[model samples]
Target chain A: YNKIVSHLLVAEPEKIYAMPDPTVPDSDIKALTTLCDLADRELVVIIGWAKHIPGFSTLSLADQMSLLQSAWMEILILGVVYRSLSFEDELVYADDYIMDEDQSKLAGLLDLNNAILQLVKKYKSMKLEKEEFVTLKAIALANSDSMHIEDVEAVQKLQDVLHEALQDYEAGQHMEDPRRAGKMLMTLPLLRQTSTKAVQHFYNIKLEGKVPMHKLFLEMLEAK
Target chain B: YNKIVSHLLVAEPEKIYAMPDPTVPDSDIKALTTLCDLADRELVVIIGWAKHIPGFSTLSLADQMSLLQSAWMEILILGVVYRSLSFEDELVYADDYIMDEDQSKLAGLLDLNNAILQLVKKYKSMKLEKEEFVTLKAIALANSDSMHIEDVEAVQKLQDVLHEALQDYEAGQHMEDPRRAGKMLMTLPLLRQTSTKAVQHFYNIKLEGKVPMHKLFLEMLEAK
Candidate 1:
């Protein structure tokens, strides 16, 4: 389940880890644009994945929209940060753009990027496995309290499966670290705050016209 | 359902709404301690409520713990803010202690209280009904993505009923506000962030010994 989910969400490492285009002007607007586009595409894929879950279609359209709006930014940031684990000073966007710490500083996204970097560092320090990341993704996406979802029970049910899967994976994979489960659960609030800041930063960018976000993306932002 | 839930969670309106404690010192530490105690009791009641839910006990103990840790702070802040709805210059704690704006500033919890105040203002401005508040509480507490619940499907089922109940209540009770449902759904992220900050502020207080948190409350803080 994790391998399939990983494949759907992450680009091939070969593609994602390619060298950066140093010649391109390293502007804040350019970086913000790149990040927003990546976020937009990732969100669409997340929504598509959500629609494929067993009982997803049974939820009222309003609930479906609500859940998507609620969780997309958080999940998007999670995926982005997870993939950037190998890099030392920079974070990768999709399989193409790279924003290093210095560049992120210029982007005025230093705080936002730094927060995500800290979370990634904690995640790495914990030695989390691939299965853990996948399960966390699912848990973040299927948040039960997504305000307007018509069939929260259906969403909750789906999240439960993911939650149980994570527990089973932990018990089977990391027997030595008794507190690992709790530690990972602790990251949700951090993930939420990072996503919230990301939303605010992007909104500032939208107002500045650095990146003209698409209508769907704008809708997601407004909902946030 | 909300009436029962409210009765379980809050003191009687007459008792809850008594006059301020004039004899007590209007100190920040005193206010912080009061809010913390109320939060702790409310959290315990929330757990008891969860235990009584039909399928809640069917979940593994780890799953139950995860759900509690994940949603407790969010629900705590939501309930706290909900009770403070009628206040303008001051905020209510546990429906009893009132921390005025000036007092909150002295407590060094100005930002945290201000955030909750803003949320309450937005909630009031939106003209949210009592049924909406109760349903929202249920939604927050039953959050599906709490990390390790075994029977998410069952929990989701419960949340679905609550979700539908809220929808029906809205349609039946406020036919004039066609977009009220969407507007209310948008508040979840705000509720989450505010709650997240509230936890942080209280954690700092705990460190300073301004208010000694109970063991279970400490566990909740550490788990987060």
Candidate 2:
């Protein structure tokens, strides 16, 4: 738990994401294209960052990769949501690309955009802290342990440690609200839900040939 | 188009979904378990329902199954949404298990529940009709043509015919609203988005051991 906290404190960042300078004005296709490019960059970073996660490297190599493949969207989305917490309901896709609520609607993703905005509202209400968000990422990224991945036993042991870390973190930091951890944990299901929506959103962009998805993003979806 | 209209008219019913008798109280677990049973039954029906769809059998055997596998959730969710449109903003999971706006929140699906209810509100506002709903199933079911299927061209041809059918159906039935087909068709993306959320919701129910998913659902998620 101590090691996890120390590593997370050092590895977590104020700004590690920004879209490449968008080449065109903000059409729906441009917005979507930019979003894909940003996800591609972040995904590369997330792959390397996983090894830094305390205990993540202890699992078998295949299981380690499997957990990531299954949970990449969930992990990326938490980072996106955490980055945008300071806003009212707007989403910061990257430093260069902030999404107003209507942008996704204009892109014909009205339901997904609204789902994400509501998530922002819920997180803002909690006054979600960086520490909590980072811990949530650990939980969210590994929560897919039972997703037919190999090495379930090892993954379970890894998760056992993280949950206690969360419980301890809440106890030490948010003593005024013991249920903060519980409330924070309940948000897990939403992350998973939004992650699913995110996959669909991007796939439609891919399916309709609206944007060119990176090979990296393609592998994530193409995985079972 | 004629055969499509005739089959849908007979097969579409005023009532189909209903929860089995609840043995316990109305807890989240009970509600979710009942939902699973209903989906299992509905999935069987959906699989059989596909053969009756006009032009579905023209595709190769592999493509036929793949299309159904990909879009089954979209098809089912649309039917679920269409059935609930009679109410202001309630979800008719089953005749016995109608959900108020709060039930899904209580079941820890605030974002998803809200997304779906809002979809119902949108459809209700449009005064969506049964014929439109059935034509939509034809479109939604086959619209996954570009989803890495074995026979994209065949699926495209099938979808082309269905889209024309929708256009003609709208032209004849809703002449007052020239854009009725466009409006109804715009609902496609939401169906896909909501379908993803539904998969995640049920998966979490399966993931946490909250409910036993049917073998059919297991197959859908397990499919490549």
Candidate 3:
């Protein structure tokens, strides 16, 4: 019956990854990545900070980095950067950047990792999500001086991890394991290219404000 | 005591607009507008469909138009354009836009209202909605022989509606009523001079086959 339906529609039902609750504590990176691997499906990660996992609020910087790298594959699969961990932080009005508290939280995450050297997240393809990347860049730019060499290397490593995972995802193969996705993806160039395109076109860009991308995607489908 | 606590950041309150329950429908417009009014001292108007009203679904065409127009002022004050009503004709394809049985209900509404020119609606301020205008355009295009004359009029009316509302909003003045807003606005020489500009900028633009002004406006704010 499902085969008939798929044939009739000439399309396959995509596996959806979603965070049902938006106000929960620490987002379960493990579960989300498992979801990505099991279905090699695309999902929306809703990072609800105010109610996220309790430990995240108190996690040490090293612990945070550990968590980020652990879920790096899932984050790449989803093309979402902000809603993964938590959504709490003070907005800073520094000479170079000004953002609200939630955005500040995202910045603090990236800054704490001190991994990213220079990366620009573009925001136009997502339409209503333009602000998401703008805010991300602002957060990323908070203080270059604050980003140590280790932090920059860590970001490059995270990017490398995603690059590999995307390669597999685009190759039309199952990720099977989020943690293993990047390592597995290193073998597939076609999938990596598509996933990379998606990352650059959709996820990489951001604004201080989160884009209701999930809703926007739904709206795009409904509007027609 | 409340003031002191609020000033001291001792209380954490959920934003009033965060909760969404589709079961009780009429209040959607009222609730959003009230929140907007509270957020900004500036008065504004919102216009939306009241398909959520318990008995509204069974109303006659004249009755529907009457309801829509009569509530224009209140809708404007609310700054909302609720499109709870939907249309579907038949499930021809399994594709997303292809009418499924569920969507056929919405499609049926579109067919009926499009035939009577009843489905289209206008909202307060710089706004246009697809479920409102796209169907109208499709119908007009289909019956172009007869609707050609009406087409210009219909588009002009929409432009006029947008122009008047935007001027009132930009001037930062609230009218005694919605009709007064219409009257005062349509009478503006500025609209006469810039009607095309407004229509071109806000009235006719569509993204992914729907009016995107609201999404753009929402994007300009903090997205979830």
Candidate 4:
């Protein structure tokens, strides 16, 4: 319980996203640099955020790697889209590196960016709350479906716990939305669908030798 | 969802709980015959009941046996306690057979009976509802923790779906009990704890040659 509350409030994505500026460049490599920079930084920050999730560290380091590798893109994209829910149509990679439709089209991320906008619109339309977001991340983070989890029972238990938490909170605290929990769970598939595309996008970036990826990104891609 | 609704209302445990008067004698062997008789019949009834659960029949017959063996004891006890919640201070084993404090003590089931009374009182005090009861049964039925499930992923998926279903139902339709889902889940551990003792109780009966157990009971105990 403490873990759930803390996981929601402790991660200061606001402060993390507060960089001054990045080069406003038109060239492919120049724009890719900014995207990669923000993505790499976000990945590192999420690894720290994972510690706050309930019973996360109880997992063996192998499981930690396994889960992060499995859900890294999903969580990353979810975090990115959540930021845009407030920014009103502009997906904020960071304060200065907002990726609008034109920027995304120019950067070869138009389709991926379109999906994020759709999710941002959908979540905002529902007025998605903090509890819903955190629970979704916890479910995503506690995944055991990726293969070789070493402890399927424990992982499934944690995932089930989050699902219960989200549901209970919905019924107890957020009574205004009757079907909020079900509707919220429904959104996860689209988030995951977009994240799969994200993996393909980045893999091609590395595949073409257009950019050198971080060890975690390379490993996460390979694991995918 | 239809599976859940159908499972709750369609089984007609009332009709199943109906039968001619079982011979009620003070003799240990005589009393155990009734117990084993009811247990064996209940086991058979539940097999038909399992078909109504969502995706249950999708599991191979082997998985069905695995899940049923794992959960049968818990479900049987839970059903007994649920019956008592309405009977008020009395447990209705069937239309004709009821177990009281004296019967339990003379039959060497006082400890187990005491636990059932405690659970019945606790749930009665909570004013447990039908929806809560059925979802709890669904979760218990979808367990995956036991050894060698063969298809761990499939089993775990069903388990997770039921958990979500329980939570969503709580937040949506069962608004009167804000903490119903959490409180309902908390009750499961005690159910399993008592079921473990019930196994020991029956196993001793089988071991001492006092009562012959059905094939299902023997295997269910070994599986336990």
Candidate 5:
């Protein structure tokens, strides 16, 4: 389950799509174009992975779609953070494209992206383990508040299990900080906020006619 | 219609709920408590206003709920921005309670809240008119991509109308920037990211067991 989740949510080995043209004079455009592809891949993989989770597949097709669409951005942020832990100053996209702090700032992500970098550093300082990260990712998705869901109780049940898993892992581990679980949980909001920042940049560029987002991704945004 | 939207999205003069104990030592707790009430009111009002919109009620009940749940944060941010335009360095909650930037930063919203201040300042610099603000708020809610929506195209049609309305407003205003429409659209993303930041801080406090969020608000977060 962890491996599947990692592959689906985190870093996929193969590059599913190419980065937008580096030759684009508008740096914001180039950055957003790259982000568009990044968000698209993230959304597609999240939907693909949601099916493999036990209770997720049991959801009605519409419920499943609702959950996927509403929470994919949050899921993508979690995945990106997980990957960012391997490096100190840069963000790695799709296991291939790397963005240093300067590049990300140029992408109109100066403040939010900087905050994310700070978060990554803080997480590393805490030495967050793989189990905790995976469970957190699940919790992020499972905690989505999309209103169309028919079986929210089921979704909540899934979240409870994942939440418990993280708690159990934390309790068992002799961590330096006794309050590690609370701290880890605290990161969820930052992850969520960062996702919003990414979405905002994507839309800004889209409206400017700088970058064209994938049709499927646009549909996903519209919950079509 | 605009009056209803304002009443629903923005604040009323009366206190809807009593403030949390000012005596609480944890400033973060107080900030979160105040922020919680602010967000709850914002969400409830958006839902109330959404029902009044033409064509929104015609959708499946599930779709209506989905759109409300998914778009409330964005709507709240827009409403907050509209309110923020009057202030300089502080965020006024529900048109009464105010938190200075330092207070907000202490409440764990240092970067995001500061960014919002900058955005508000920028908006003021642009002299964004009330008509544009109202139209943009409508567009923000109308463009919700809630999954399981029965008629995506219907929502899009509403969005198109609002988009055109915004364009027409921009065309007639003789604004400082010819690209003002695009610039205004760009602000939507920032509004969205700011909302995410608020949610994140709220969650962090909830996990810390500092501020107790409203039950409905909690349910809204978990998609219950």
Candidate 6:
């Protein structure tokens, strides 16, 4: 609780986690309903990414919800862990997930990318030369964590690879060829990092920050 | 009313839209509160973009909203019409606005860039063969409309320049040169036939067909 509370800003929350009533005139409720439905859709898509997870498709909604929430929290933490590693390539690659076109394959990629882009923009714009990207990365990662995550180990694995990629980025090997970053990205075997970050960065660059996290994340995560 | 009837998905009327009573858990209330706040924030942010005028900033937020909701419908429409204008060399100058280092002078530049990057990846992954580069260039102009006028117009002017820069992307006209795309983007005053396609392409690419009728009409008027 303290850890979570410690990270929050005095200004406002980065996202809203709500169970809204559908009857409201406010579209946020409508958006939330769409989001929860998308979460279900995303899980189905991600199941498609894996081969023959047989009865996994047959799981009950309660079970699926449970699975995803657990993963969500852990993935949230891994984003933090990856940030702490200060791996530049990993950071960029992870961030690019948002930019990819196949949202079902990599749901959170664009959000991750936008977060990184924003951090870079904020730091560069402020002209903070000596600061560590990890500090900002961690905050951004934590910010992502604030969203719903129901899959624990999957997200943790994601964080680990992210950290490794960041290690590679910090080593200055992957930036020259984002494909190399992608190769490094693929070694994790579960999540493929291609189109994700690119898509995310594209939106971050285009809409600035108006890319809806739920819509983007759900889109990427749905089938991956 | 009919649009809502046709486009709106029928959702179960759960508690999602209802106003909270005190019986709900504090945590749940907090979650809903955060969601409400974010929805409000998005409204504020979108309104900021939609209401902006050459001299709109001096007016109050209320005035801005009123203008955006009422007077600017034609401007929105014209943006689409002008978007299709045969503005050659527009993308070339617009391409100059793409920047990585400085932040303050070029607000929303990164966001637009991120969006472009996403589109690029999408096209590449999908292997779409159309000449998307021009549309990509125009997208930067439309998204960066919120920047201070000089910077904003700089993007507008650069549309032609971006096109020229792309033709020479390998030749190092700008992307490799590391100059602010804005400065170079500021030079495009002439429009061309293919460039008109790019502008129309940009509108379709960024807003999708879902953009409101009023907003569409207003951008058209603004372009005139």
What is the TM-score of candidate 1?
0.54
The sequence of per-residue lDDT tens digits that candidate 6 reaches over residues A1-224 is 12212222221212222343446553322433433443344334433322122223344554444444324322332232343243432332222121222332244344444434333332333232212232222222211221234453453343343344343442463344332222222122111121233333333533444323455354444432
Q: Let me know the DockQ for model 1.
A: 0.09
Worst 10 residues of 5 chain B by lDDT: B6-15
- Tens digits of per-residue lDDT for model 6, B26-136: 342233233233323333333444322223355455444443432232222222223223332121111221123233123223433233333233233323321322322
Q: Write the per-residue lDDT of candidate 4 for residues B89-166, one digit (tens) a residue.
A: 577777677888788877788878887877787688668877777777767787523444777678867866776677
Model 5: what TM-score?
Answer: 0.49
User: For model 2, how does the per-residue alpha-carbon lDDT over B1-224 read when each residue is reduced to its tens digit?
Assistant: 35566677787644565645656777777767777778777888887777777788777888888887878777777777877887766777777777876887677766776777766866776788777788888777876522347765577568667777776787787888654565565455455556776776666677788577779877875662
> Which is better, 4 or 5, measured by DockQ?
5
Residue A194, model 6: lDDT of 17
Residue-level error in angstroms, candidate 2, position A156: 0.3
Write down the worst ten-residue block by lDDT for model 4 chain B: B12-21
- What TM-score should be assigned to candidate 6? 0.21
Candidate 6 segments whose C-alpha is farther than 4 A from its true place: A1-122, A129-132, A145-147, A150-197, A200-224, B1-56, B59-212, B215-224
Per-residue CA lDDT of model 1 for A83-155, tens digit only, reads 7888775676656666778877888878778878877776776676666776677667775345455564576
For model 4, the local distance difference test gives: 0.71
What TM-score against the true fold does each predicted structure earn? 0.54, 0.52, 0.15, 0.51, 0.49, 0.21
How well does model 1 score by local distance difference test? 0.66
| Residue-level lDDT tens digits of model 2 in A1-224 | 35576677688744555554546676777767677777777888887778877789888788888888878988888877877888766778777667776876777767776667666766887798877777778876766633355675567567666766776787788889654555565455456656776786677667788577789988886673
Estimate the Cα RMSD of every predicted model relative to the unseen true structure.
12.5, 20.8, 26.3, 16.9, 22.2, 24.2
lDDT minimum window of 10 residues, candidate 5 chain A: A6-15
* lDDT-superior candidate, 3 or 4: 4
Q: DockQ score of candidate 3?
A: 0.01
> Local error of candidate 3 at A95, Å?
52
Task: Count steric clashes of candidate 5.
Answer: 3
TM-score of chain A of each: 0.84, 0.91, 0.20, 0.90, 0.82, 0.25
lDDT for each residue of candidate 5 in B105-207, tens digit (9 for 90 to 100):
6877777677667657757866877677766677667654443466766765665555555655666665554445644554554555566666665566667
